[PDB]
Amino acid sequence: MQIFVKTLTGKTITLEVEPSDTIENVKAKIQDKEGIPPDQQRLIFAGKQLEDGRTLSDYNIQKESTLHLVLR
């Protein structure tokens, strides 16, 4: 499925993921497309900082959701 990731600059990143993918997996995918190391990324959705170890399905993040990327 496809999901989006929006940065502070307003840039929107499109990712191909599976519901079973962990947040750290998603961060590596962002690094693959943008060069930003996972350790410098904070992903937020529904007011929660998404934690490594949990999957998109754990957070009930479905197709075409737009996550918020904040740098750390």
DSSP 1-17: -EEEEE-TT--EEEEE-
Contact, 65 vs 2, CB < 8 A? no
Domains in the chain, number = 1
- In a 3-state reduction of DSSP, which class is residue 22? strand
End-to-end Cα spacing for the chain: 27
Q: What is the Cα–Cα distance from 19 to 57, expressed in whole angstroms?
A: 5
Q: What is the Cα–Cα distance from 72 to 64, expressed in whole angstroms?
A: 24
Q: What is the Cα–Cα distance from 19 to 32, expressed in whole angstroms?
A: 19
Q: What is the Cα–Cα distance from 10 to 21, expressed in whole angstroms?
A: 24
Neighbours of 57 (CB within 10 A): 12
How was this one solved? Answer: X-ray
Query: In 4-72, which ranges are continuous DSSP H helix?
Result: 23-34
Structure's resolution in angstroms: 1.8
The CATH number that applies at residue 14 is 3.10.20.90
Contact, 69 vs 41, CB < 8 A? yes
Domain that holds residue 29: 1-72
DSSP 31: H
Q: How many residues does the chain have?
A: 72
